[PDB]
Amino acid sequence: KHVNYKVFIYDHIRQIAIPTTNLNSQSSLEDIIDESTSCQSVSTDGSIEIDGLTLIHNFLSESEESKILNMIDTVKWAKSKSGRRKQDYGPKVNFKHKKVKTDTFVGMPEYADMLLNKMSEYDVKKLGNYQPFEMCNLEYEEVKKSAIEMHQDDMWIWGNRLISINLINGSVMTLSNDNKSFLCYVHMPHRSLLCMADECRYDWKHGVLAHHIRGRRIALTMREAAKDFAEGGELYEKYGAELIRLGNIRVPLSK
Ligand SMILES: [Cl-]
Ligand SMILES: [Cl-]
Ligand SMILES: [Mn+2]
């Protein structure tokens, strides 16, 4: 990635990013996981907080994951870029031409209610009051060298909060503040949830590197209504209200 950047590591316990010179642009997953444990004993000097980075360890039980995954695998997996394969329960959108098509959007997966309810329980303010606009499951495999390029998700139809859930196996999220020249690594463990919002959503860029992917990982990705497409917004009548109605619909996957 970027050699000149200052590398940081995330302490889940302290909810801060701690500066590390033992970690680098090409650092291995194992090194980042060990630093995640060894950053918990370091001073707060030079430490930074990325607002909107919320990592919940153990969001889903083995039992809860088993039900969601069996429903996911029965559904077909589509081709995608960068070694990824995808299942998209969302509208078809041309971000450049601001066009939304609801032809392929039938609703949201039946497991959605459980995930949304649990997010509200942990924090109603932080993860509650979420209306699903897109729920996309992404397949990453070490053999296929799957990865996602450093990026900021579109902010026109997708809202402040972006949710990624690590299924089957965990990974590391690399976050880049190009202007501030800061690189941070967030280790998302198995059955964990990440919400990227606020500074993380707009100021920082998010990507999953190939060397940080082991075995097969499925990202259950969720997106929320942009305020413009929501009630009290310009596009609600043209596009948002239908999208809320379709998102309220649940596709039966059990079966
Ligand atoms: Cl799979
Ligand atoms: Cl992503
Ligand atoms: Mn993204």
Author numbering: 34 to 288
Please share excerpts from the published article on this structure.
NMAD-1, one of the AlkB family members in C. elegans, demethylates the DNA damage modification such as 6mA and 3mC. C. elegans NMAD-1A protein has 291 residues involving an N-terminal extension (NTE), a nucleotide-recognition lid (NRL), a DSBH domain, and the CTD. Like other AlkB family proteins, NMAD-1A requires the binding of the cosubstrate α-KG and ferrous iron for catalysis.
Here, we show three C. elegans canonical isoform NMAD-1A crystal structures with different ligands, including Mn2+/α-KG, Mn2+, or SO42−. These structures present a conventional and conserved double-stranded β-helix (DSBH) consistent with multiple unique structural features of a stretch-out Flip2 motif and a functionally indispensable carboxy-terminal domain (CTD). Finally, we chose to engineer NMAD-1A with site-directed mutagenesis to increase the binding ability of NMAD-1A to nucleic acids, thus making protein crystallization easier. We then expressed and purified these NMAD-1A mutants involving three mutations (E109K, Q112K, Q114K) separately or jointly from the Flip1 region and determined their binding ability to different short nucleotides using FPLC. Next, we collected the peaks of the protein and nucleotide complex for crystallization. In addition, the main chains of Asp-186, Met-188, and Ile-190 in the structures containing the CTD further moved into the active center 2.3 Å, 2.7 Å, and 4.1 Å, respectively. Hence, four copies of NMAD-1A found in each asymmetric unit were due to the crystal packing. Moreover, the positions of the L3 are the same between the determined three NMAD-1A structures and are probably fixed by forming interactions with the DSBH domain.
